[PDB]
Amino acid sequence: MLEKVVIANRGEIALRILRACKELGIKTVAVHSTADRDLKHVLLADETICIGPAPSAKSYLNIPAIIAAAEVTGADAIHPGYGFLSENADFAEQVERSGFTFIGPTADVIRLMGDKVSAIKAMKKAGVPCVPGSAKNKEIAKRIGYPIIIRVVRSEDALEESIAMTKAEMEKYLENPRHVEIQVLADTHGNAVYLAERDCSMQRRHQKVVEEAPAPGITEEVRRDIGSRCANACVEIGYRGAGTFEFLYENGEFYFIEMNTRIQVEHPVTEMITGVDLVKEQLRIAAGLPISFKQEDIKVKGHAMECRINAEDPKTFLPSPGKVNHLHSPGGLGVRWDSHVYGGYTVPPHYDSMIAKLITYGDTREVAIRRMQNALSETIIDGIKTNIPLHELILEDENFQKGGTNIHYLEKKL
Amino acid sequence: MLEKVVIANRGEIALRILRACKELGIKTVAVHSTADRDLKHVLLADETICIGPAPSAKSYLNIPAIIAAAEVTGADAIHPGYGFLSENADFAEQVERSGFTFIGPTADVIRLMGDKVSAIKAMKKAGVPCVPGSAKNKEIAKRIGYPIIIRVVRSEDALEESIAMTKAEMEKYLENPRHVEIQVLADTHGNAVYLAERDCSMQRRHQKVVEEAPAPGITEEVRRDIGSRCANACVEIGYRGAGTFEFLYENGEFYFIEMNTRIQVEHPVTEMITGVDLVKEQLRIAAGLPISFKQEDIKVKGHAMECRINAEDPKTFLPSPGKVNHLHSPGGLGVRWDSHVYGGYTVPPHYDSMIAKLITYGDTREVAIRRMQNALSETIIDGIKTNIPLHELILEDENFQKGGTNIHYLEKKL
Secondary structure, X not given: OOOEEEEOOOHHHHHHHHHHHHHHOOEEEEEEEXXXXXXXXHHHOOEEEEEEOOOHHHOOOOHHHHHHHHHHHOOOEEEOOOXXXXXXXXXXXXHHHXXXXXXXXXXXXXXXXXXXXXXXXXXXXXXXXXXXXXXOHXXXXXXXXXXXXXXXXXXXXXXXXXXXXXXXXOOOOOOOOEEEEEEEEEOOOOOEXXXXXXXXXXXXXXXXXXXXXXXXXXXXXXXXXXXXXXXXXXXXXXXXXXXXXXXXXXXXXXXXXXXXXXXXXXXXXXXHHHXXXXXXXXXXXXXXXXXXXXXXXXXXXXXXXXXXXXXXXXXXXXXXXXXXXXXXXXXXXXXXXXXXXXXXXXXXXXXXXXXXXXXXXXXXXXXXXXXXXXXXXXXXXXXXXXXXXXHHHHHOOHHHHHOOOOOOHHHHHO | OOOEEEEOOOHHHHHHHHHHHHHHOOEEEEEEEHHHOOOHHHHHOOEEEEEEOOOHHHOOOOHHHHXXXXXXXXXXXXXXXXXXXXXXXXXXXXXXXXXXXXXXXXXXXXXXXXXXXXXXHHHHHHOOOEOOOOOOHHHHHHHHOOOEEOOEEXXXXXXXXXXXXXHHOOOOOOOOOEEEEEEEEEOOOOOEEEEEEEEEEEEEOOEEEEEEEOOOOOOHHHHHHHHHHHHHHHHHHXXXXXXXXXXXXXXXXXXXXXXXXXXXXXXXXXXXXXXOOHHHHHHHHHOOOOOOOOHHHOOOOOEEEEXXXXXXXXXXXXXXXXXXXXXXXOOOOOEXXXXXXXXXXXXXXXXXXXXXXXXXXXXXXXXXXXXXXXXXXXXXXXXXXXXXXHHHHHHOOHHHHHOOOOOOHXXXXX
């Protein structure tokens, strides 16, 4: 089956993958840049291989070097995590052509869902609701209804002009949409399940900051409908592994915007409310096993929240690399801490600024939120700036407390 | 209701209580010795009061000083944790007589279950199974059956002699008994529930090292019988709050040995498999509220394990006080860390050697155990010795892996 896995990633997700591997008794190979020799998962891995200098282009995006690490270690499979090469279909195609198991979908499915329109077209074929959309551009614009996007457009006298400018360089635009996303798994035995949903509406410049599960207001009827549509979409497109269908959500209707064909950063909130270990299921599915449970086995229990703790200034958002002179991580009941950072670790400049995901669970949304506030108050990261103050502002916001804030809300509030 | 609580304890349990209080919006008063000014919960508390010098007798056992801290802060209630004064009926009696709510049972119930025989006699009256037991001492010894305890006794020709010697300074003695204990809650509304059981058989000199829940081999039928007997015992004796009935368990039968009338050190494993927050329920019950769920709401799900991490040499067990120069605590899915220790903290000589409880959860006992082994491998406590190597030996023991080892097993193995 799978005996040895190359972890083609870094930071917290690399550690998350290492932990799943070690639980399953799978040997690990940590590929790393010269800058990441002191990463926690590297220090814990069974074998390590330096694949290039610091810049990502020369290391974690270095397809030949990663494949070569698999070859020389005699690895069976490669787990790409999220970001980097995880949704690069040329990488997947090359991993397979080279005799290794890619822990993810097939190259062809990646490429299909990797392209804006082809994705939307496969979803519309599948019965998943998409956004109303695509000179007879005035007629189309008209039927869809303004506002629109080509550059946004709030009226028709600007349409023509806009068209010529958006080119050189159409989804109905919604203004009370939440970001609501459905987690799925599909296996090589023809099964596909949905694992409730997540609300990830708290965003800055389209980067998520806080996520939660289940999504407030979503009844189980509605969950069952949209979730069943996503599972069937999985079967229809021959999906394999973990994936997420992202939707805009408004006045009770869902509208597809993207499928991430990989594990999600915020997968832990789903784990907390369903009891499923999503990374272990990725590994088992890649080994050829069936999903370890059936749809009827899944029931949402309680509520979970996640704060992405970043090394950055909490108002300017400029990165804050440097030595963590002291770390104190929170704990206790209903507190989960997913992080590679340790006291004495130096956060480097070369990559993203995420240093930890703090995840809480409670019987109710209210309990999960209070537990997050208390856990954040206990957390100490000395030596660098973090966005903890931003989290604290969000968590005490009366509208967030009420629930249901839209995807534009954070930027409006600040 | 309860607006301000004096936390009459220290170390990890004091932090556990502070976390529950803060979730409920209850103000905290940390009473502490001069040696404990840098305890995490002290640093997090709303108010602090130094109640004496380092020795416990002069501080955490100082009844007048603790009561005085409640008076001057205008506190409503006192939570005694475990150990120290928590089962001191004179303390409880004085807390009540002085106008504060004791978070625990009434003084009279403490005293009743505080005495060896009176406890056993109330249990036998209650229908809880006790151990067969109490010159017509040969006749009694005979009916009970050797071996016996007065000094253990394996035959009758020694009985007489033994009797005279055990005096100046009788439970059937069992030799394949496990330690199996039932968690209960009882409220001021006449309700009493049982929260499955824990197996705490891995012990050295009658001090627990590793605990787990549920107990291997215990079917739900058996759980329901012994648990219902314990709940009814609660009502019959007018119990209030959290408590544990400890049993010896053998060839399918239970035998009562002690009731701890307070929260248990190893309460977290029960929290993990039932979803109940036992300390929050203590606080709510003390405020006069009902238990927040009914018996039918409780269902064991999965399996949990706890390792008591102590600052001591892992073979000699001599304490290892000193500065923790570096701490790295484990995390991820199914890992819970309950500890007051932080990088730079100095573990003092004056108290017990517990510095952390590492708790894991999994869908099966096998998963909980592997997760514990991996979490222990990630844990770093630099500057002092710990018993982590002992935990590692226990967890990989083939008999522990099989499950069901008795209370003498650890000392035999070493």
